Amino acid sequence: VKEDQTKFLKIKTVSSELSCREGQSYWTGSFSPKCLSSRRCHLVGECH
Amino acid sequence: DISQCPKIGGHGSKKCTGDAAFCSAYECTAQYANAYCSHANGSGIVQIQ
């Protein structure tokens, strides 16, 4: 009714972005080795 | 007891024979022996780092 109601619904367009659709993935980091050594003479244990 | 077998160029109480290492270390007899002395499978001196 004139001088009444007049309700406004607005659709603001904030932004348009070119998003990514990820495929495969994996994880990685930094690694360092540690070694334990044992020296045995011949015919000792499995020194064959 | 290996304390009885004489050391090379030494005196002992029992005739004693063995393998190559024993004959290199101790005196292996030329007569009838009383015991057989083999070298230890894995023995030695163990050192840790």
Ligand SMILES: *[C@@H]1O[C@H](CO)[C@@H](O)[C@H](O)[C@H]1NC(C)=O
């Ligand atoms: C000597 O001893 C080792 C263990 O130190 C063993 O594995 C090996 O079979 C032995 N060898 C023989 C009995 O000829």
